[PDB]
Amino acid sequence: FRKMAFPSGKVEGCMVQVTCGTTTLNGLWLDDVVYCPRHVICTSEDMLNPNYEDLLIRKSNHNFLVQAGNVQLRVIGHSMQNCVLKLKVDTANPKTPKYKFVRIQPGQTFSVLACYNGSPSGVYQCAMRPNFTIKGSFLAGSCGSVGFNIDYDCVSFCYMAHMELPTGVHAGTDLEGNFYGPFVDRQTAQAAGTDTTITVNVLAWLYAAVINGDRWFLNRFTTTLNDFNLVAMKYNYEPLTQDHVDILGPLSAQTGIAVLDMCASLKELLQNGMNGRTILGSALLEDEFTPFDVVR
Amino acid sequence: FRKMAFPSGKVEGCMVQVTCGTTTLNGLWLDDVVYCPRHVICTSEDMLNPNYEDLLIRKSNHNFLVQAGNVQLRVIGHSMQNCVLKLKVDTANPKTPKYKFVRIQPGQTFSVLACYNGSPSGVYQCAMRPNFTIKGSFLAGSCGSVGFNIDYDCVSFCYMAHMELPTGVHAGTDLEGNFYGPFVDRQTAQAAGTDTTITVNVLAWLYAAVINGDRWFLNRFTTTLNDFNLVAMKYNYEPLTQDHVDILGPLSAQTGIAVLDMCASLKELLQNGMNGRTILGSALLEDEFTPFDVVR
Ligand SMILES: *C(=O)[C@H](C[C@@H]1CCNC1=O)NC(=O)[C@H](CC1CCCCC1)NC(=O)c1cc2ccccc2[nH]1
């Protein structure tokens, strides 16, 4: 049971390089618009107290160099939506897939296509952590790399990287420029809050273990939502909600293990450990598969 | 320091669906040849003792249905090279990338594009295990999916999946149809040998941890090569060879830590565990980064 990223080809055809002054980063080219973090227009002096609308006012199209591989794309307009810069360009991207912009919630998963200076380097699967950060690519120049899900050849773009936080994780926005988490695109002291394990995803992963014949951790016991959350808080797991219980419904129907039965298994695992056993392949409980990921 | 798969777009444009009778799986369309596992010509009565020369001589070109998306490719020739079938087709793939065929060795890494009925479903990075199998979440219908590296826009194809072993891992061939390991394309009792940890890769990754500022696991000890292997084999670690020591040389010189000194650290990590700590972000000794990967 490997974590898999989505095939990245549809996104690879959209990655471009965007340069403003001395700063170069990645941009996303869909139709005749290139999207990228607005902080590309900032010099170091601006980064401490940026006035973004005024800085964009002082910029012209000729300040923006956009290159899609060998071809330079002529910028013919520029505007801002929240924290995302929108560069209108000469030419519509002939490789634009069917796509949508969506905003995801903490705990949901997606693939990141790590890019350096407009060229894709690698792809990985991750989850939006409860503290609204993403485990880092650890690749310089990754600003502007995007996160996405693919559903029947429609690409749902959900993330763009704006920053690396001191712990290596990155922070960023949706494609409408709205930050995930309490972070700002200014040079200031910012840090990831204390993170928690995504409980509903661990439960999904235990159901995957059961579907794949790994059942030693099942027991006769059951728990209540409130009793579980008391243990959850103790081991810094996200509280489980009734909505979480409901989305696990199809897995509970498929396996015969009610969610509160599996919560009893998880509670025992947290309080007593694994006794040298493994689940699927791991001595560690995995939390970067959603219920949806497990069904599919 | 995330494990990443290569961007898969160059391989996605080569994946097709190959059908022979009732049997459907994945093929690789490069230039005017489609490569796929030869057991596509097996019926249900053929799995236990297939006679491939006899099964193939009875086929004509029109017995092979090849579908590239919504387009049928016309097969105009067919032949067998070891365990891989080669279908010559009407049309050279216009999306053929620069490519080579390479045979890899246990411990080397590559990306797998997992596919179902010719359509890419996900991508992941892995290592060829010492027992010549791949730990892969491989759906029904993933036969014919391929493994690859990408270097300077050249795709090196090293692997094609042929079957699942009873323990959930898969086995396959190079693109000349020669199996990795002692496996055969026959439904027999064949099982993966005991898997071992890839020692040289763990050591390379500990060097990467030192380079990125982790040092907590270092100690004041050294070891002889023979004493290390005597201990490491008690944890199901692969033995370290003088070739492996030579390969680690550049990282030794970069860090100022002798190879046998790092080996002493590994010995202590196996004895002590991590004690709640992390190395490059993980709670596990990672063995799927090669020295080449790390030096890069
Ligand atoms: C964007 O591509 C680069 C990516 C890496 C990280 C730093 N240098 C690189 O090549 N990231 C940046 O350019 C941002 C710019 C931000 C400035 C502050 C807030 C808005 C955008 N810088 C960082 O991501 C950054 C700087 C920094 C300094 C000290 C600790 C952490 C840290 N992260």
Curated annotation (Swiss-Prot), chains A, B:
Glycyl lysine isopeptide (Lys-Gly) (interchain with G-Cter in ubiquitin) cross-link, renumbered residues: 3, 88
Record localization: Host cytoplasm; Host Golgi apparatus; Host nucleus
Catalytic-site annotation from UniProt: 39 (for 3cl-pro activity), 143 (nucleophile)
Residues on Cytoplasmic side: 1-296
Domain Peptidase C30: 1-296
Catalytic activity: TSAVLQ-|-SGFRK-NH2 and SGVTFQ-|-GKFKK the two peptides corresponding to the two self-cleavage sites of the SARS 3C-like proteinase are the two most reactive peptide substrates. The enzyme exhibits a strong preference for substrates containing Gln at P1 position and Leu at P2 position
Regulation: Inhibited by pyridone-containing alpha-ketoamides compounds 13a and 13b. In turn, alpha-ketoamide 13b (tert-butyl (1-((S)-1-(((S)-4-(benzylamino)-3,4-dioxo-1-((S)-2-oxopyrrolidin-3-yl)butan-2-yl)amino)-3-cyclopropyl-1-oxopropan-2-yl)-2-oxo-1,2-dihydropyridin-3-yl)carbamate) inhibits SARS-CoV-2 replication in human lung cells. Inhibited ex vivo by michael acceptor inhibitor N3. Inhibited ex vivo by compound 11a and 11b.
Subunit structure: 3CL-PRO exists as monomer and homodimer. Only the homodimer shows catalytic activity. Interacts with host FBXO22; this interaction promotes the proteasomal degradation of nsp5.
The protein, known as: 3C-like proteinase nsp5
